[PDB]
Design an enzyme around this catalytic site. Structure first.
Site, short mmCIF file in Angstrom:
data_model
loop_
_atom_site.label_atom_id
_atom_site.label_comp_id
_atom_site.label_asym_id
_atom_site.label_seq_id
_atom_site.Cartn_x
_atom_site.Cartn_y
_atom_site.Cartn_z
N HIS A 61 0.75 -1.20 -0.13
CA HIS A 61 0.03 0.06 -0.05
C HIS A 61 0.75 1.12 0.04
O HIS A 61 0.75 2.20 -0.86
CB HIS A 61 -0.78 -0.06 1.30
CG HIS A 61 -1.84 -1.32 1.30
ND1 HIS A 61 -2.77 -1.48 0.38
CD2 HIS A 61 -1.85 -2.15 2.07
CE1 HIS A 61 -3.17 -2.69 0.86
NE2 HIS A 61 -2.78 -3.11 1.73
N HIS A 91 5.02 6.95 7.17
CA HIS A 91 4.91 6.67 5.70
C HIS A 91 4.37 7.90 5.07
O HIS A 91 4.07 8.83 5.52
CB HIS A 91 4.02 5.37 5.62
CG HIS A 91 2.49 5.91 6.25
ND1 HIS A 91 2.00 5.46 7.41
CD2 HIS A 91 1.49 6.47 5.56
CE1 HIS A 91 1.00 5.99 7.63
NE2 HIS A 91 0.28 6.45 6.58
N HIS A 93 1.68 9.23 1.42
CA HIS A 93 0.63 8.89 0.40
C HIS A 93 1.00 10.00 -0.74
O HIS A 93 1.48 11.05 -0.44
CB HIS A 93 -0.98 9.30 0.89
CG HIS A 93 -0.91 8.70 2.20
ND1 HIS A 93 -1.95 7.38 2.30
CD2 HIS A 93 -0.74 8.59 3.68
CE1 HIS A 93 -2.16 6.87 3.26
NE2 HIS A 93 -1.41 7.71 4.15
N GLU A 103 -3.96 13.30 1.18
CA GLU A 103 -5.22 13.07 1.74
C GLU A 103 -5.87 14.21 2.23
O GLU A 103 -7.02 14.41 1.70
CB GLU A 103 -4.82 11.87 2.77
CG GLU A 103 -4.14 10.63 2.25
CD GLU A 103 -4.41 9.58 2.91
OE1 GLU A 103 -4.11 9.41 4.23
OE2 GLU A 103 -5.01 8.61 2.28
N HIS A 116 3.02 11.13 7.00
CA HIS A 116 2.07 10.59 8.25
C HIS A 116 3.24 10.02 9.35
O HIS A 116 3.57 8.96 9.00
CB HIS A 116 0.96 9.56 8.03
CG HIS A 116 -0.18 10.47 7.20
ND1 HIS A 116 -1.12 9.57 6.58
CD2 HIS A 116 -0.49 11.68 7.14
CE1 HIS A 116 -1.90 10.45 6.06
NE2 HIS A 116 -1.64 11.76 6.36
N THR A 195 -6.78 6.35 7.71
CA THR A 195 -7.18 6.67 6.39
C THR A 195 -7.02 5.30 5.51
O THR A 195 -7.58 5.50 4.41
CB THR A 195 -6.48 8.03 5.71
OG1 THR A 195 -5.10 7.35 5.62
CG2 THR A 195 -6.48 9.07 6.57
#
Ligand SMILES: NS(=O)(=O)c1ccc(CCN(Cc2cccc(NCC(=O)O)c2)S(=O)(=O)c2ccccc2)cc1
Ligand SMILES: NS(=O)(=O)c1ccc(CCN(Cc2cccc(NCC(=O)O)c2)S(=O)(=O)c2ccccc2)cc1
Ligand SMILES: [Zn+2]
Length: 257
Positions: A61, A91, A93, A103, A116, A195
């Site tokens: 992911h 991590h 996104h 996000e 994050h 999330t």
């Protein structure tokens, strides 16, 4: 299994994780004119001098940089928080293009990526207990825009070739997460959720106002990661972000005037 494809992306998650349509989901749009300055918020304390990174993992992911959280080494305190929150992992996104990837949004603006830094409340003893509590986690969110390189990100960028596919990990000791912070700790805060599935409503969100700058070459290397495992057809790890969710009965507070 859940993901970010047409067939298993965010619009599908509620079928296995009904809290996806819950009352305190994340991320959200931050309407900067509606967020209220709260003079009662304490200054935020980011205490990362004793941080012990251990490993970097491609989980299919994103990638997680994991820390030793078996003692108070790298902690988040103050701001909206009561007590001590230990750093367990960070991590990101990110998008397929520079105009998407974050996000959270700010007045509907999407940033190229979002970092994050994930912390758990020590009063619950372990991470798995903490995610069952409404005040179990604190996630520090930091926006990424594309411009100048971030020197403190390069050690991350350069190990990504070694964890290209799902399930691969590599040693990642001696990494200082202070090198990923912007100058200002001004923030917005609201109560929300993880999330990704299982979308648990356990997070105090602290989103920094000031984005960090990373280079086009740095984010290009994020986009060369794979969602697939070794020996499988290639599916680039891009667009691993959940869109903004309804704010419902929540107020976003600002730490700054
Ligand atoms: N609510 S959620 O977001 O957690 C969620 C759970 C399950 C699903 C279902 C996923 N599939 C659609 C699909 C998409 C692409 C290919 C394939 N087949 C090729 C293959 O894998 O052999 C199937 S699939 O059931 O067919 C399937 C399941 C597991 C592994 C592979 C495939 C969605 C969404
Ligand atoms: N995007 S975000 O910031 O909102 C966000 C989303 C998801 C998560 C993922 C948290 N982990 C997986 C997980 C999720 C839910 C419950 C549990 N319980 C503990 C367990 O199952 O052993 C673990 S984890 O991969 O960091 C982990 C792995 C092993 C041990 C502990 C933690 C963080 C943050
Ligand atoms: Zn995240």
């Amino acid at each position: 299994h859940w993901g970010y494809g047409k067939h298993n992306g965010p619009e599908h998650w509620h079928k296995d994780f009904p809290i996806a349509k819950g009352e305190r989901q994340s991320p959200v749009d931050i309407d900067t004119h509606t967020a209220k300055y709260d003079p009662s918020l304490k200054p935020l304390s980011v205490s990362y001098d004793q941080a012990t990174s251990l490993r970097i993992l491609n989980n299919g992911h994103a990638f997680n940089v994991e820390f030793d959280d078996s003692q108070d080494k790298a902690v988040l305190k103050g701001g909206p928080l009561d007590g001590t929150y230990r750093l367990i992992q960070f991590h990101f996104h990110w998008g397929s293009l520079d105009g998407q990837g974050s996000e959270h949004t700010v007045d509907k603006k999407k940033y190229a990526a979002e970092l994050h830094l994930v912390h758990w409340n020590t009063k619950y003893g372990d991470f798995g207990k903490a995610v069952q509590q409404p005040d179990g986690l604190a996630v520090l969110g930091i926006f990424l825009k594309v411009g100048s390189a971030k020197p403190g990100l390069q050690k991350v960028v350069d190990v990504l070739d070694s964890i290209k596919t799902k399930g691969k990990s590599a040693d990642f000791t001696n990494f200082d997460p202070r090198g990923l912070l912007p100058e200002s700790l001004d923030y917005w805060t609201y109560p929300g959720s993880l999330t990704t599935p299982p979308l648990l409503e356990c997070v105090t969100w602290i989103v920094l106002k000031e984005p960090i700058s990373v280079s086009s070459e740095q984010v290009l290397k994020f986009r060369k990661l794979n969602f697939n495992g070794e020996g499988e057809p290639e599916e680039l790890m891009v667009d691993n972000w959940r869109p903004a969710q309804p704010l419902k009965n929540r107020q976003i507070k600002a730490s700054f005037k």
